[PDB]
Design a binder for this molecule. Sequence first.
Ligand SMILES: CC(C)(C)c1ccc(C(=O)N[C@@H]2CCCN(c3ccc(C(N)=O)c(Nc4ccc(C(=O)N5CCOCC5)cc4)n3)C2)cc1
Length: 263
Amino acid sequence: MEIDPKDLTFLKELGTGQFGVVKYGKWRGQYDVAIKMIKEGSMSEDEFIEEAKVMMNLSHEKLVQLYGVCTKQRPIFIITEYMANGCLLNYLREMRHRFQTQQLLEMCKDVCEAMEYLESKQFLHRDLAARNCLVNDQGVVKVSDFGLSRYVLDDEYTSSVGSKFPVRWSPPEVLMYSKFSSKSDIWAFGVLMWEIYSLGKMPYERFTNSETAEHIAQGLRLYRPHLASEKVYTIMYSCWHEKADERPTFKILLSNILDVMDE
Ligand SMILES: CC(C)(C)c1ccc(C(=O)N[C@@H]2CCCN(c3ccc(C(N)=O)c(Nc4ccc(C(=O)N5CCOCC5)cc4)n3)C2)cc1
C-alpha cells in the first residue's frame, strides 16, 4: 500500500481535485500515474489511511485503480491509474468530438459496470457525477474518487446545506436526512446519465441548490434530453423514484442498458 517517494517522478500538473493539485508522473521508472496531493488540513488522514487498505482491494476495469499512498511525509499523496483524456464532463463538452447516441449509451454502460462492482462489495461512492469520472486513451469511462467525500474536512462540502455540497446529484433522503445507501448512488447515476445525454449540461440550470432541493420535493425531475430515446429516459428516470426502495439496483440497470443497446 505504501509507495516510497524515491520510486516516483513528479511532472506536469493535470489540474485541481477536492484535496488539492493532481500531477502526472511515473512510478518505478515505468508506469504512468496520477499523483493526488492532499493539502495538509483538507482531509481526516487517520480515517482515510485505514480505509485505503479496503480501497486497495477494489479492482475493476471500469474503476480508476488505486496503486498506493505516500504517508511517511506531509502533504500525503494518493497514487492512481493515469486517465489520458481526463475529466468526463470536459470530454462531453469538447466540441471537437461528435458523439453517436450508441457511444453515449456505452459511456453509461461503463459507469454502470463499475457501480455494480462497488455495490457488490457494499462500497458507496457518495459523490458520483461526470466531474468525478475519467476517460482513458481508448475513450473508456471509469469511476474515480469513490468513497473519498467521507474524509473531506470542509463543512461547505460535507453539510447538505453547504454551498459546495452535491445537491443536484442527491436524492430527497440525502438532502433532508443525510441517508446514504446504494440507492443514493443509484439516484446520482441517473443524474450522471442525464449529464451524458445532455452532453455535459449542468443539471437544473437556472435553479440554485435550495431551489433544486425544492423542485425535487415537489416531485419534479430532469427533463428528457433529446438524444435520449423513451427507453433510455425510462432507465435514468427509474433512478429518481421518491421511495429509495422502488429504485433499481446496478445489476437491474446494467441488464436494462444491455437490453436497449441490443434493440
Ligand atoms: C483546460 C482544459 C484543457 C480544457 C482541461 C480539461 C480537462 C482537465 C481535467 O481533466 N482536469 C482534472 C479534473 C479532476 C482532477 N484531475 C485529474 C484527476 C485524475 C486524473 C487521472 N487519474 O489521470 C486526471 N487526468 C488527466 C487530466 C487532464 C488531462 C489533460 O491533459 N487534458 C484533458 C483532455 O484535454 C486535453 C488536456 C489528462 C489526464 N486528472 C484533473 C483539465 C484541463
